[PDB]
Design a protein around this motif. Structure first.
Motif, PDB file in Angstrom:
ATOM      1  N   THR A 193     -13.099  20.801  41.602  1.00 26.16           N
ATOM      2  CA  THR A 193     -14.284  20.213  42.226  1.00 26.16           C
ATOM      3  C   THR A 193     -15.188  21.256  42.898  1.00 26.16           C
ATOM      4  O   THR A 193     -14.807  22.427  43.106  1.00 26.16           O
ATOM      5  CB  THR A 193     -13.923  19.030  43.168  1.00 26.16           C
ATOM      6  N   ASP A 227     -14.018  12.640  45.383  1.00 26.53           N
ATOM      7  CA  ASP A 227     -14.255  14.073  45.622  1.00 26.53           C
ATOM      8  C   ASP A 227     -14.010  14.929  44.382  1.00 26.53           C
ATOM      9  O   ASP A 227     -13.960  16.160  44.499  1.00 26.53           O
ATOM     10  CB  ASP A 227     -13.323  14.579  46.739  1.00 26.53           C
ATOM     11  N   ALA A 253     -18.763  18.946  47.009  1.00 31.10           N
ATOM     12  CA  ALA A 253     -17.784  17.847  47.129  1.00 31.10           C
ATOM     13  C   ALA A 253     -16.793  18.086  48.278  1.00 31.10           C
ATOM     14  O   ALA A 253     -16.552  17.192  49.089  1.00 31.10           O
ATOM     15  CB  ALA A 253     -17.032  17.621  45.824  1.00 31.10           C
ATOM     16  N   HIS A 254     -16.237  19.292  48.358  1.00 36.82           N
ATOM     17  CA  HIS A 254     -15.292  19.633  49.428  1.00 36.82           C
ATOM     18  C   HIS A 254     -15.919  19.480  50.808  1.00 36.82           C
ATOM     19  O   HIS A 254     -15.234  19.154  51.761  1.00 36.82           O
ATOM     20  CB  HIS A 254     -14.823  21.090  49.309  1.00 36.82           C
ATOM     21  N   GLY A 311     -17.900  17.199  51.580  1.00 43.07           N
ATOM     22  CA  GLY A 311     -18.086  15.776  51.766  1.00 43.07           C
ATOM     23  C   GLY A 311     -19.484  15.279  51.488  1.00 43.07           C
ATOM     24  O   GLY A 311     -19.827  14.213  51.956  1.00 43.07           O
TER      25      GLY A 311
END
Ligand SMILES: [Cl-]
Ligand SMILES: [Cl-]
Length: 317
Positions: free
Chosen positions: A204, A198, A208-209, A211
């Motif tokens: 990030t 991630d 990404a957070h 998913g």
């Protein structure tokens, strides 16, 4: 477990011979085979990991696909760059020891990481430095993106200075890099079951957070958070890094209202204008969309104008 006998000669898949030196992952100094020992000023390193190590395989594939010395040089010439901060691939092979199988890769050796230098400067980089770093990172990101990869983990500890030239910065660590566009086929807006990672939580991307697999806008978003961190010493969510849902919530709200991010990070004070513009431009990108890198570079070039400077390649570190 020791993977090499210091001073041994290892031969890569292209039959090129190298000698192993002292440590400097498991990374050792390396040089071309000669009568001399490998010294502290060696121009290469050898990365070695068990052959079943996933990240070194991913990294090797990136380097073989996109970091061939003549591939980089051609790009430098055709885009008229001074240099390109993608480290060069010099070879790889397979190395057996004590009945275990290892993979190895030879690559450029570098000087200091930027995180060390940032911490020695009391967790600030100047505006001049941040603009010059970011211009070169944009060159790197455009290159890797055009060769079907995103990095997903841009940060100062993954930025290394040329060993002989402290005004040239390189983006390293492709063990977790993602081929977002294999054979020109962009990945779908979804989690990739093959990819667990991630990125680094404070930097990030919102993608990404959520998913999903990292894409091009994610890299540019990461660089945005790095710029703020570098200019100010802080990010708003830095005391909540054990709580991913908080970090995501904060990033989402701050993307929806960029002026509030600027008020938060540059408090009781004007924000440098290029940073809000950079973030506004990245916000407009869809998941699959190709960035307009030149426009992003123009935004940063305007920031250099604003401080009475120009792109002279000087990182001022
Ligand atoms: Cl190419
Ligand atoms: Cl501080």
């Amino acid at each position: 477990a020791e993977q090499f006998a210091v001073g041994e000669i290892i031969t890569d898949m292209a039959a090129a011979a190298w000698k192993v030196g002292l440590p400097i992952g498991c990374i050792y100094l390396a040089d071309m085979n000669s009568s001399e020992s490998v010294g502290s000023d060696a121009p290469c390193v050898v990365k070695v990991e068990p052959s079943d190590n996933g990240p070194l395989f991913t990294e090797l594939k990136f380097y073989q696909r996109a970091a061939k010395p003549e591939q980089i040089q051609k790009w430098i010439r055709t885009r008229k760059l001074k240099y390109l901060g993608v480290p060069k691939y010099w070879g790889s092979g397979l190395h057996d020891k004590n009945g275990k199988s290892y993979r190895f890769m030879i690559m450029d050796r570098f000087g200091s990481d930027l995180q060390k230098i940032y911490e020695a400067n009391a967790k600030r980089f100047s505006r001049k430095t941040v603009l010059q770093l970011s211009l070169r990172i944009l060159d790197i990101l455009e290159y890797i993106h055009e060769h079907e990869y995103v990095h997903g983990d841009i940060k100062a500890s993954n930025l290394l200075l040329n060993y002989k030239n402290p005004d040239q910065v390189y983006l390293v660590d492709y063990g977790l890099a993602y081929r977002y566009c294999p054979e020109g086929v962009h990945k779908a807006y979804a989690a990739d079951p093959k990819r667990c990672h991630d990125g680094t939580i404070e930097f990030t991307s919102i993608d990404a957070h959520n998913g999903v697999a990292p894409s091009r806008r994610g890299d540019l978003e990461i660089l945005g958070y790095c710029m703020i961190q570098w200019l100010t010493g802080h990010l708003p969510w830095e005391d909540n890094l054990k709580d991913p849902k908080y970090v995501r919530d904060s990033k989402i709200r701050y993307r929806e209202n960029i002026a509030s991010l600027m008020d938060k990070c540059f408090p009781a004070a004007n924000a440098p204008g290029e940073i809000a513009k950079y973030m506004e431009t990245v916000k407009l990108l869809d998941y699959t969309e190709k960035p307009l890198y030149e426009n992003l570079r123009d935004i940063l070039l305007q920031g250099l104008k604003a401080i009475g400077s120009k792109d002279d390649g000087k990182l001022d570190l």
